[PDB]
């Protein structure tokens, strides 16, 4: 067998679901070891009586740490710590073929296509969401659902972009992307779709096909609001009940005895509000939209069951007034709802992540904070994109001289080597720092010094608790 440094400094956990799977686990461990993995654990699910022990984050960190686990190798998601591994710790879960194909092709293949989660219906998609179609709260919601469906969000157009999400034929991005020609050969064949392409997969938990697939395609004749409304109603309207969305997410009373007040600073396209309201009510929750003209004391007196506030911005005066009337109210954003849906448990915001509270005012500008990142995998990449976005900056998967920072947790790879040299060049002077700088800047709402020693620690993978997304969580 051949050897390489492909998996240098990475830790793997192989979950064996049945005795017959042991030879596959052995061959995968050999592949990992021959290509220089740091550590490879094999864990036989069938050989412990796990149905009487809480397999929570503490259990997982104690059993498989103290170092982090970079990848879980499993051909199934049917193990009782899947949600804490995947949705909390943000560790990818991939089939054995991810290892086999990554060795064959001598590279770290994207993990999405190898997820064994049947709800990851968009796993093969690389999706660009147009910022000239959507406001910030719409963009964040569509990004959240795309991510929950296993797709990849991109903020650049390339010949690998599979879908471009647009609101209407009036978006100028349509003609711009269509003019990306060379001579006149196109960069690729483009698929422009309305956001109901995402929403249908999320609501129905099955692939789009037939006429409903065609209705999600951009139609340049849809020049009126009425025509857009009509397509939304046919594709995700009340006659399309969630046929198998609850098969994969069986807690139909997730939001029972909760009643959410929806802040007016969420200015959704109205059929998108209807989608969100229906999503909550389908989980036995209640919904009351607030208006800028409401007398809040009157509203909360009439609906004393309202116990949650959902809003976009931390600095909304509506939220300030709400907290003075209801001091114990849960204060979250829309992302928080979808995180509880993923966890299948109602969870107070203080036990969730930094990205699940109404967002701070932008701390940085894009001129100050345009960051490349490296050595993150899977949902960690989505998290850093979101964190940089709500700090006020821009993120890039590529490294260029436009970048102000490189964010990394280790010293491996080409970008770290290049950026370290650039940091010493006065003509460039990029800053290399770890993700805890981003997290602490946001949590403290303050521009911390990225060269502090705690942000120059590039051995964070030595402790699983330093995984990105852990800062800010209450036990």
């Amino acid at each position: 067998s051949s050897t390489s440094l492909l998996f240098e400094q990475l830790n793997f956990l192989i979950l064996v679901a049945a005795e017959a799977e042991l030879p596959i686990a052995h061959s995968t461990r050999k592949l990992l070891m021959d290509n220089s993995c740091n550590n490879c654990q094999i864990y036989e699910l069938y050989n412990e009586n796990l149905k009487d022990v809480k397999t929570d984050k503490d259990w997982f960190m104690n059993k498989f740490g103290p170092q982090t686990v970079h990848f879980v190798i499993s051909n199934t998601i049917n193990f009782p710590f899947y949600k804490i591994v995947y949705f909390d710790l943000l560790i990818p879960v991939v089939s054995h073929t991810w290892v086999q194909d990554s060795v064959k092709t001598k590279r770290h293949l994207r993990t999405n296509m190898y997820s064994p989660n049947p709800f990851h219906l968009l796993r093969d998609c690389q999706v660009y969401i147009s910022k000239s179609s959507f406001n910030k709260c719409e963009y964040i919601l569509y990004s959240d659902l795309l991510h929950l469906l296993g797709g990849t969000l991109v903020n650049y157009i390339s010949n690998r972009t599979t879908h471009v999400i647009v609101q209407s034929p009036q978006d100028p991005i349509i003609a711009t992307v269509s003019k990306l020609t060379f001579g006149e050969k196109p960069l690729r064949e483009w698929k422009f779709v309305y956001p109901i392409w995402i929403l249908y997969h999320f609501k129905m938990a099955k692939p789009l096909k037939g006429e409903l697939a065609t209705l999600c395609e951009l139609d340049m004749q849809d020049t009126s609001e009425e025509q857009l409304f009509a397509k939304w109603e046919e594709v995700i309207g009340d006659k399309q009940t969630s046929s198998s969305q609850l098969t994969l997410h069986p807690n139909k009373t997730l939001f029972k005895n909760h009643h959410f007040a929806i802040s007016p600073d969420l200015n959704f396209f109205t059929p998108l509000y209807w989608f969100l309201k229906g999503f909550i009510e389908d989980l036995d929750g209640k919904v009351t939209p607030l208006s800028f003209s409401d007398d809040l004391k009157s509203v909360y007196q009439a609906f004393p069951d309202i116990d949650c506030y959902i809003g976009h911005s931390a600095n909304s005066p509506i939220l300030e007034k709400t907290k003075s009337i209801k001091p114990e109210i849960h204060v979250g954003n829309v992302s928080w709802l979808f995180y509880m849906f993923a966890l299948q448990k109602f969870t107070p915001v203080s036990q969730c992540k930094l990205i699940h509270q109404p967002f701070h005012a932008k701390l940085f500008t894009s001129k100050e904070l345009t960051v490349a990142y490296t050595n993150y995998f899977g949902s960690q990449r989505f998290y850093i994109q979101r964190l940089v976005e709500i700090l006020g900056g821009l993120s890039t998967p590529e490294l260029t001289r436009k970048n102000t920072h490189l964010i990394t947790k280790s010293t491996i790879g080409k970008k770290f080597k290049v950026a370290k040299k650039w940091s010493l060049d006065p003509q460039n002077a990029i800053i290399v720092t770890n993700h805890m700088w981003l997290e602490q800047c946001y949590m403290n709402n303050s521009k911390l010094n990225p060269k502090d020693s705690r942000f120059q620690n590039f051995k964070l993978d030595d402790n699983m608790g330093w995984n990105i997304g852990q800062i800010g969580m209450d036990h």
């Binding site: 092709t105 590279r107 770290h108 293949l109 994207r110 910022k131 000239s132 179609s133 959507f134 406001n135 910030k136 719409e138 903020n155 650049y156 157009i157 390339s158 690998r160 100028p172 991005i173 003609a175 711009t176 992307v177 003019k179 990306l180 020609t181 060379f182 001579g183 006149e184 960069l187 200015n267 890039t396 590529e398 490294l399 260029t400 001289r401 436009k402 790879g413 080409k414 970008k415 080597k417 290049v418 950026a419």
Partner: protein
């Protein structure tokens, strides 16, 4: 809310391709990509890319 006139989008292009790009598109900037990591068989290990900021067409 949404970005409007005069804004741009990011386009990742082979460096070779830039000189052949539609001359009617307005390029705000172009940046050479360094330390590219191919994560798909469709990208070759030594492909040289750039990022172009392309103005939205009027």
């Amino acid at each position: 809310g949404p970005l409007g006139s005069g804004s741009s989008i990011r386009v990742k292009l082979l460096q070779e391709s830039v000189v052949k790009l539609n001359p009617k598109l307005v390029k705000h900037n172009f940046y050479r990509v360094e330390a590219n990591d191919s994560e798909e068989e469709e990208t070759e290990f030594d492909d040289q890319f750039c990022i172009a900021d392309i103005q939205l067409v009027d």
